[PDB]
Amino acid sequence: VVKLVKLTFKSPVHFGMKRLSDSNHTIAADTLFSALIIEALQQQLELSHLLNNLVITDLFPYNKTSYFLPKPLIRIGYKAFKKLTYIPVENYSEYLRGEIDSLEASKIAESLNLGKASLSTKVSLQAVDHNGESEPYSVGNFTFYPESGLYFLAKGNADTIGQLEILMHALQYSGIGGKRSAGYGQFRCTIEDSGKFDSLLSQTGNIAILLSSAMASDEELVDCLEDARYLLKKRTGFVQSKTYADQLVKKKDFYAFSAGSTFYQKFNGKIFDVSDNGRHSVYRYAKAFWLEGKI
RNA sequence: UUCAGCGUUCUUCGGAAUGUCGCGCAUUGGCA
């Protein structure tokens, strides 16, 4: 049951990539899954549905004009083609067939208006009272245009879909990304049946494109890599919880194929464990959502 | 010789702001 989940952001979001100063306009499926797990644990729900039947996608840019999917890594002005990152759903088939030209790719890049990124310079006055000093730091945020929003597609049974609806409503108050609970990431989310995507997903093409940041199991990896065009993205971070350890602990470093990576042989994903001797297992979504296309 | 005032100017010409600062310091950065 693939359900579109559109997110409208009221306040700017941080979405850090490596540092607090930087910012991204989207987040990986794992970052969303980790937020969904944290929420389910707060609301005292069973994690079996999320860990066994929920399939999600990286949040993708959406505009009133169009919904943007990630640019497939398919061999085809090379600058114009490399600058392009997201292609509207209507132009995805044209891009796959090679019917797109460099000027058309430039127009597609200009078409997206997800938002306007910025850097907010904050200060910490915690040490001023102890003969210390104010400490400047920078938070990179991204402000969506009013029509613009981030959407994700969630697939699963009816039970996990309803659980997702509950977690999503709680999540909007919780927020997403970094510096949430410090002014950022408040969003309001709608869950609906989308005719566009379900029709798009009902295609049996010769190539498979990874909607979500995903990694195959070892046995899956050996068949999948042959003839694959892909971009290994390091997935790293600290553990966010009150019960994992007394102090803040980094997760084990993970590498996942990025969204838009094209694999000839489809691989199902796996919820990996990036924990290192903690009081609970830190789950890292790496399951795979596939858009089959014809090239 | 008496009887009366009547007309014309109602303000004018200059000067209309000027000079001086136009953010500084601390954290940060930089050097070590």
Side-chain angles (χ1 to χ4, degrees), chain A residues 131-168:
Chain A
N131 296 321
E133 206 89 38
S134 55
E135 187 206 281
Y137 69 100
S138 296
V139 168
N141 48 89
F142 180 88
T143 302
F144 295 89
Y145 293 157
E147 293 78 55
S148 309
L150 295 186
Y151 73 92
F152 75 89
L153 311 168
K155 176 179 46 190
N157 272 337
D159 275 320
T160 187
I161 284 304
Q163 175 158 320
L164 171 79
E165 319 233 347
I166 271 70
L167 297 188
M168 279 316 291

mmCIF file of all heavy atoms in Angstrom, chain A residues 131-168:
data_model
loop_
_atom_site.group_PDB
_atom_site.id
_atom_site.type_symbol
_atom_site.label_atom_id
_atom_site.label_comp_id
_atom_site.label_asym_id
_atom_site.label_seq_id
_atom_site.Cartn_x
_atom_site.Cartn_y
_atom_site.Cartn_z
ATOM 1 N N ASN A 131 32.630 33.818 34.562
ATOM 2 C CA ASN A 131 33.795 34.570 34.099
ATOM 3 C C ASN A 131 34.305 34.072 32.751
ATOM 4 O O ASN A 131 35.450 34.347 32.376
ATOM 5 C CB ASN A 131 34.928 34.542 35.131
ATOM 6 C CG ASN A 131 34.555 35.235 36.425
ATOM 7 O OD1 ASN A 131 33.893 36.272 36.419
ATOM 8 N ND2 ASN A 131 34.977 34.661 37.546
ATOM 9 N N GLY A 132 33.474 33.340 32.014
ATOM 10 C CA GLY A 132 33.858 32.832 30.714
ATOM 11 C C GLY A 132 33.558 33.813 29.604
ATOM 12 O O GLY A 132 33.839 35.007 29.732
ATOM 13 N N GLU A 133 32.980 33.326 28.510
ATOM 14 C CA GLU A 133 32.745 34.171 27.351
ATOM 15 C C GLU A 133 31.582 33.617 26.542
ATOM 16 O O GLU A 133 31.223 32.442 26.654
ATOM 17 C CB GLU A 133 33.999 34.269 26.476
ATOM 18 C CG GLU A 133 34.084 35.533 25.653
ATOM 19 C CD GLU A 133 34.768 36.659 26.391
ATOM 20 O OE1 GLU A 133 35.741 36.384 27.125
ATOM 21 O OE2 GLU A 133 34.339 37.821 26.232
ATOM 22 N N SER A 134 30.993 34.488 25.728
ATOM 23 C CA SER A 134 30.017 34.052 24.743
ATOM 24 C C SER A 134 30.708 33.241 23.653
ATOM 25 O O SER A 134 31.852 33.507 23.283
ATOM 26 C CB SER A 134 29.303 35.255 24.132
ATOM 27 O OG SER A 134 30.231 36.180 23.596
ATOM 28 N N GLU A 135 30.003 32.241 23.142
ATOM 29 C CA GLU A 135 30.571 31.342 22.138
ATOM 30 C C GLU A 135 29.731 31.378 20.873
ATOM 31 O O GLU A 135 28.596 30.863 20.875
ATOM 32 C CB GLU A 135 30.657 29.917 22.679
ATOM 33 C CG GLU A 135 31.396 28.962 21.767
ATOM 34 C CD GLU A 135 30.968 27.527 21.960
ATOM 35 O OE1 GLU A 135 31.429 26.891 22.931
ATOM 36 O OE2 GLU A 135 30.176 27.031 21.135
ATOM 37 N N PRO A 136 30.208 31.985 19.789
ATOM 38 C CA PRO A 136 29.439 31.965 18.541
ATOM 39 C C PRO A 136 29.487 30.597 17.882
ATOM 40 O O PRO A 136 30.517 29.920 17.880
ATOM 41 C CB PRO A 136 30.134 33.022 17.673
ATOM 42 C CG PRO A 136 31.054 33.760 18.587
ATOM 43 C CD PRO A 136 31.415 32.817 19.678
ATOM 44 N N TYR A 137 28.353 30.194 17.315
ATOM 45 C CA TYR A 137 28.287 28.994 16.498
ATOM 46 C C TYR A 137 27.270 29.237 15.396
ATOM 47 O O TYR A 137 26.480 30.179 15.455
ATOM 48 C CB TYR A 137 27.945 27.750 17.329
ATOM 49 C CG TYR A 137 26.538 27.703 17.878
ATOM 50 C CD1 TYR A 137 25.555 26.953 17.252
ATOM 51 C CD2 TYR A 137 26.200 28.387 19.036
ATOM 52 C CE1 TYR A 137 24.273 26.899 17.753
ATOM 53 C CE2 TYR A 137 24.919 28.339 19.544
ATOM 54 C CZ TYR A 137 23.961 27.593 18.899
ATOM 55 O OH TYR A 137 22.683 27.540 19.399
ATOM 56 N N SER A 138 27.329 28.408 14.361
ATOM 57 C CA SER A 138 26.508 28.593 13.175
ATOM 58 C C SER A 138 25.641 27.365 12.953
ATOM 59 O O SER A 138 26.123 26.233 13.055
ATOM 60 C CB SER A 138 27.375 28.859 11.943
ATOM 61 O OG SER A 138 28.092 30.074 12.079
ATOM 62 N N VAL A 139 24.366 27.594 12.658
ATOM 63 C CA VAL A 139 23.421 26.539 12.323
ATOM 64 C C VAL A 139 22.959 26.780 10.895
ATOM 65 O O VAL A 139 22.402 27.840 10.588
ATOM 66 C CB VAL A 139 22.228 26.512 13.292
ATOM 67 C CG1 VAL A 139 21.129 25.617 12.759
ATOM 68 C CG2 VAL A 139 22.673 26.047 14.665
ATOM 69 N N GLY A 140 23.199 25.811 10.020
ATOM 70 C CA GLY A 140 22.751 25.943 8.651
ATOM 71 C C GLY A 140 21.326 25.466 8.489
ATOM 72 O O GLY A 140 21.021 24.309 8.778
ATOM 73 N N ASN A 141 20.441 26.338 8.025
ATOM 74 C CA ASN A 141 19.038 25.995 7.876
ATOM 75 C C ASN A 141 18.619 26.147 6.420
ATOM 76 O O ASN A 141 19.343 26.701 5.592
ATOM 77 C CB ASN A 141 18.156 26.857 8.788
ATOM 78 C CG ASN A 141 18.488 28.330 8.700
ATOM 79 O OD1 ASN A 141 17.935 29.053 7.872
ATOM 80 N ND2 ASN A 141 19.390 28.786 9.557
ATOM 81 N N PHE A 142 17.432 25.639 6.112
ATOM 82 C CA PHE A 142 16.926 25.728 4.724
ATOM 83 C C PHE A 142 15.463 26.108 4.789
ATOM 84 O O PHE A 142 14.683 25.403 5.457
ATOM 85 C CB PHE A 142 17.170 24.367 4.070
ATOM 86 C CG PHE A 142 16.708 24.243 2.628
ATOM 87 C CD1 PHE A 142 17.547 24.603 1.582
ATOM 88 C CD2 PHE A 142 15.446 23.750 2.322
ATOM 89 C CE1 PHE A 142 17.131 24.486 0.269
ATOM 90 C CE2 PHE A 142 15.034 23.634 1.007
ATOM 91 C CZ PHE A 142 15.881 23.990 -0.014
ATOM 92 N N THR A 143 15.088 27.196 4.116
ATOM 93 C CA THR A 143 13.691 27.635 4.230
ATOM 94 C C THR A 143 12.994 27.272 2.947
ATOM 95 O O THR A 143 13.388 27.790 1.886
ATOM 96 C CB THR A 143 13.651 29.139 4.499
ATOM 97 O OG1 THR A 143 14.391 29.328 5.701
ATOM 98 C CG2 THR A 143 12.239 29.663 4.675
ATOM 99 N N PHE A 144 11.973 26.430 3.050
ATOM 100 C CA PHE A 144 11.190 26.006 1.866
ATOM 101 C C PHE A 144 10.336 27.161 1.375
ATOM 102 O O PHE A 144 9.858 27.963 2.203
ATOM 103 C CB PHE A 144 10.376 24.776 2.274
ATOM 104 C CG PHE A 144 11.235 23.571 2.628
ATOM 105 C CD1 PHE A 144 11.692 23.375 3.925
ATOM 106 C CD2 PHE A 144 11.586 22.642 1.658
ATOM 107 C CE1 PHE A 144 12.478 22.280 4.240
ATOM 108 C CE2 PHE A 144 12.373 21.550 1.982
ATOM 109 C CZ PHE A 144 12.816 21.370 3.269
ATOM 110 N N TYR A 145 10.108 27.231 0.061
ATOM 111 C CA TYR A 145 9.169 28.260 -0.462
ATOM 112 C C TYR A 145 7.795 27.784 -0.029
ATOM 113 O O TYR A 145 7.648 26.581 0.268
ATOM 114 C CB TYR A 145 9.451 28.428 -1.958
ATOM 115 C CG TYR A 145 10.821 29.028 -2.244
ATOM 116 C CD1 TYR A 145 11.451 28.834 -3.464
ATOM 117 C CD2 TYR A 145 11.472 29.807 -1.297
ATOM 118 C CE1 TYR A 145 12.693 29.384 -3.731
ATOM 119 C CE2 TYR A 145 12.713 30.366 -1.550
ATOM 120 C CZ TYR A 145 13.325 30.155 -2.772
ATOM 121 O OH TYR A 145 14.549 30.698 -3.031
ATOM 122 N N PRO A 146 6.742 28.628 0.001
ATOM 123 C CA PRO A 146 5.486 28.169 0.579
ATOM 124 C C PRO A 146 4.851 26.988 -0.135
ATOM 125 O O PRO A 146 4.389 26.062 0.559
ATOM 126 C CB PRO A 146 4.616 29.434 0.478
ATOM 127 C CG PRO A 146 5.256 30.255 -0.619
ATOM 128 C CD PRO A 146 6.739 29.989 -0.484
ATOM 129 N N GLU A 147 4.823 26.995 -1.464
ATOM 130 C CA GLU A 147 4.336 25.813 -2.224
ATOM 131 C C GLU A 147 5.283 24.623 -2.011
ATOM 132 O O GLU A 147 4.785 23.487 -1.919
ATOM 133 C CB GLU A 147 4.174 26.194 -3.693
ATOM 134 C CG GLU A 147 3.064 27.215 -3.927
ATOM 135 C CD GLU A 147 3.410 28.654 -3.590
ATOM 136 O OE1 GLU A 147 4.413 29.162 -4.134
ATOM 137 O OE2 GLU A 147 2.687 29.258 -2.772
ATOM 138 N N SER A 148 6.594 24.874 -1.974
ATOM 139 C CA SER A 148 7.616 23.793 -1.904
ATOM 140 C C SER A 148 7.565 22.972 -0.609
ATOM 141 O O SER A 148 7.281 23.553 0.458
ATOM 142 C CB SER A 148 8.972 24.388 -2.110
ATOM 143 O OG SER A 148 8.980 25.197 -3.277
ATOM 144 N N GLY A 149 7.817 21.665 -0.712
ATOM 145 C CA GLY A 149 7.768 20.758 0.451
ATOM 146 C C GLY A 149 8.591 19.510 0.204
ATOM 147 O O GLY A 149 9.024 19.323 -0.946
ATOM 148 N N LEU A 150 8.848 18.699 1.233
ATOM 149 C CA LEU A 150 9.539 17.400 1.017
ATOM 150 C C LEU A 150 8.504 16.276 1.148
ATOM 151 O O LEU A 150 7.735 16.300 2.118
ATOM 152 C CB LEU A 150 10.656 17.168 2.025
ATOM 153 C CG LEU A 150 11.847 18.119 1.958
ATOM 154 C CD1 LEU A 150 12.870 17.585 2.938
ATOM 155 C CD2 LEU A 150 12.379 18.124 0.542
ATOM 156 N N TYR A 151 8.464 15.357 0.183
ATOM 157 C CA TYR A 151 7.514 14.218 0.254
ATOM 158 C C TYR A 151 8.273 12.905 0.341
ATOM 159 O O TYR A 151 9.447 12.864 -0.062
ATOM 160 C CB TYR A 151 6.612 14.198 -0.985
ATOM 161 C CG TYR A 151 7.271 13.763 -2.288
ATOM 162 C CD1 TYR A 151 7.251 12.436 -2.700
ATOM 163 C CD2 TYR A 151 7.893 14.685 -3.118
ATOM 164 C CE1 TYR A 151 7.847 12.038 -3.884
ATOM 165 C CE2 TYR A 151 8.487 14.302 -4.307
ATOM 166 C CZ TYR A 151 8.462 12.974 -4.692
ATOM 167 O OH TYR A 151 9.048 12.595 -5.865
ATOM 168 N N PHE A 152 7.628 11.853 0.849
ATOM 169 C CA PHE A 152 8.265 10.510 0.835
ATOM 170 C C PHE A 152 7.158 9.514 0.520
ATOM 171 O O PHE A 152 5.976 9.804 0.778
ATOM 172 C CB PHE A 152 9.046 10.163 2.108
ATOM 173 C CG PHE A 152 8.264 9.806 3.363
ATOM 174 C CD1 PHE A 152 7.881 8.494 3.617
ATOM 175 C CD2 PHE A 152 7.962 10.774 4.313
ATOM 176 C CE1 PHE A 152 7.188 8.170 4.771
ATOM 177 C CE2 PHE A 152 7.274 10.441 5.468
ATOM 178 C CZ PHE A 152 6.888 9.142 5.693
ATOM 179 N N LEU A 153 7.531 8.369 -0.037
ATOM 180 C CA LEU A 153 6.525 7.329 -0.352
ATOM 181 C C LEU A 153 6.742 6.174 0.630
ATOM 182 O O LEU A 153 7.895 5.727 0.776
ATOM 183 C CB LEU A 153 6.660 6.874 -1.803
ATOM 184 C CG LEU A 153 6.730 7.987 -2.852
ATOM 185 C CD1 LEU A 153 7.143 7.403 -4.189
ATOM 186 C CD2 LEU A 153 5.390 8.684 -2.967
ATOM 187 N N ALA A 154 5.675 5.741 1.297
ATOM 188 C CA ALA A 154 5.791 4.665 2.303
ATOM 189 C C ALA A 154 4.964 3.468 1.848
ATOM 190 O O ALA A 154 3.795 3.657 1.468
ATOM 191 C CB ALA A 154 5.331 5.166 3.645
ATOM 192 N N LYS A 155 5.561 2.279 1.880
ATOM 193 C CA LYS A 155 4.851 1.060 1.423
ATOM 194 C C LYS A 155 4.783 0.050 2.576
ATOM 195 O O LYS A 155 5.745 -0.003 3.374
ATOM 196 C CB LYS A 155 5.591 0.539 0.187
ATOM 197 C CG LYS A 155 5.117 -0.770 -0.414
ATOM 198 C CD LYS A 155 5.955 -1.093 -1.645
ATOM 199 C CE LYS A 155 7.411 -0.882 -1.370
ATOM 200 N NZ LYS A 155 8.232 -0.956 -2.580
ATOM 201 N N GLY A 156 3.681 -0.695 2.677
ATOM 202 C CA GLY A 156 3.541 -1.714 3.701
ATOM 203 C C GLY A 156 2.102 -2.169 3.814
ATOM 204 O O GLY A 156 1.226 -1.739 3.055
ATOM 205 N N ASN A 157 1.872 -3.056 4.780
ATOM 206 C CA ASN A 157 0.537 -3.564 5.056
ATOM 207 C C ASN A 157 -0.317 -2.481 5.715
ATOM 208 O O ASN A 157 0.144 -1.379 6.020
ATOM 209 C CB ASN A 157 0.611 -4.810 5.935
ATOM 210 C CG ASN A 157 0.749 -6.083 5.127
ATOM 211 O OD1 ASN A 157 0.374 -6.130 3.956
ATOM 212 N ND2 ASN A 157 1.287 -7.127 5.749
ATOM 213 N N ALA A 158 -1.592 -2.806 5.938
ATOM 214 C CA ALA A 158 -2.514 -1.833 6.520
ATOM 215 C C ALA A 158 -2.129 -1.485 7.953
ATOM 216 O O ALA A 158 -2.232 -0.322 8.364
ATOM 217 C CB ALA A 158 -3.944 -2.369 6.462
ATOM 218 N N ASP A 159 -1.692 -2.479 8.731
ATOM 219 C CA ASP A 159 -1.340 -2.234 10.126
ATOM 220 C C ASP A 159 -0.166 -1.269 10.238
ATOM 221 O O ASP A 159 -0.213 -0.298 11.006
ATOM 222 C CB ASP A 159 -1.017 -3.556 10.824
ATOM 223 C CG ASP A 159 -2.255 -4.259 11.344
ATOM 224 O OD1 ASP A 159 -3.158 -3.570 11.863
ATOM 225 O OD2 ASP A 159 -2.323 -5.502 11.238
ATOM 226 N N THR A 160 0.898 -1.513 9.468
ATOM 227 C CA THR A 160 2.042 -0.612 9.516
ATOM 228 C C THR A 160 1.709 0.738 8.898
ATOM 229 O O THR A 160 2.283 1.751 9.301
ATOM 230 C CB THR A 160 3.257 -1.235 8.824
ATOM 231 O OG1 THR A 160 4.400 -0.393 9.021
ATOM 232 C CG2 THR A 160 3.014 -1.380 7.341
ATOM 233 N N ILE A 161 0.766 0.787 7.953
ATOM 234 C CA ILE A 161 0.349 2.075 7.407
ATOM 235 C C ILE A 161 -0.352 2.906 8.474
ATOM 236 O O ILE A 161 -0.057 4.095 8.640
ATOM 237 C CB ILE A 161 -0.535 1.880 6.163
ATOM 238 C CG1 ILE A 161 0.319 1.499 4.952
ATOM 239 C CG2 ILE A 161 -1.336 3.139 5.869
ATOM 240 C CD1 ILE A 161 1.415 2.496 4.636
ATOM 241 N N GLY A 162 -1.279 2.301 9.221
ATOM 242 C CA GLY A 162 -1.935 3.031 10.298
ATOM 243 C C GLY A 162 -0.970 3.443 11.395
ATOM 244 O O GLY A 162 -1.047 4.561 11.924
ATOM 245 N N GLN A 163 -0.048 2.546 11.752
ATOM 246 C CA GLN A 163 0.989 2.905 12.710
ATOM 247 C C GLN A 163 1.817 4.074 12.195
ATOM 248 O O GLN A 163 2.188 4.968 12.963
ATOM 249 C CB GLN A 163 1.876 1.694 13.001
ATOM 250 C CG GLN A 163 3.065 1.986 13.897
ATOM 251 C CD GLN A 163 3.590 0.743 14.588
ATOM 252 O OE1 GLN A 163 2.819 -0.103 15.038
ATOM 253 N NE2 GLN A 163 4.909 0.628 14.675
ATOM 254 N N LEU A 164 2.097 4.093 10.891
ATOM 255 C CA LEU A 164 2.818 5.209 10.295
ATOM 256 C C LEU A 164 2.019 6.500 10.389
ATOM 257 O O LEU A 164 2.589 7.568 10.619
ATOM 258 C CB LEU A 164 3.152 4.900 8.838
ATOM 259 C CG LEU A 164 3.721 6.091 8.065
ATOM 260 C CD1 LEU A 164 5.192 6.308 8.390
ATOM 261 C CD2 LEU A 164 3.499 5.922 6.580
ATOM 262 N N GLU A 165 0.702 6.430 10.181
ATOM 263 C CA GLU A 165 -0.116 7.634 10.320
ATOM 264 C C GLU A 165 -0.030 8.188 11.734
ATOM 265 O O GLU A 165 0.134 9.398 11.930
ATOM 266 C CB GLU A 165 -1.575 7.363 9.944
ATOM 267 C CG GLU A 165 -1.783 6.487 8.733
ATOM 268 C CD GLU A 165 -2.704 7.120 7.715
ATOM 269 O OE1 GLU A 165 -3.373 8.118 8.057
ATOM 270 O OE2 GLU A 165 -2.761 6.621 6.572
ATOM 271 N N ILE A 166 -0.121 7.311 12.736
ATOM 272 C CA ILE A 166 -0.013 7.769 14.123
ATOM 273 C C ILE A 166 1.368 8.367 14.388
ATOM 274 O O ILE A 166 1.499 9.445 14.994
ATOM 275 C CB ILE A 166 -0.333 6.617 15.094
ATOM 276 C CG1 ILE A 166 -1.834 6.564 15.396
ATOM 277 C CG2 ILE A 166 0.452 6.760 16.387
ATOM 278 C CD1 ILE A 166 -2.696 6.112 14.240
ATOM 279 N N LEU A 167 2.414 7.657 13.970
ATOM 280 C CA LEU A 167 3.780 8.145 14.276
ATOM 281 C C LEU A 167 3.992 9.487 13.569
ATOM 282 O O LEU A 167 4.613 10.378 14.172
ATOM 283 C CB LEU A 167 4.801 7.098 13.840
ATOM 284 C CG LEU A 167 4.713 5.755 14.566
ATOM 285 C CD1 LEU A 167 5.881 4.866 14.200
ATOM 286 C CD2 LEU A 167 4.604 5.953 16.065
ATOM 287 N N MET A 168 3.494 9.611 12.337
ATOM 288 C CA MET A 168 3.714 10.855 11.556
ATOM 289 C C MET A 168 3.055 12.054 12.257
ATOM 290 O O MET A 168 3.686 13.131 12.288
ATOM 291 C CB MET A 168 3.154 10.717 10.137
ATOM 292 C CG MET A 168 4.073 9.980 9.180
ATOM 293 S SD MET A 168 5.806 10.473 9.276
ATOM 294 C CE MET A 168 5.769 12.139 8.602
#
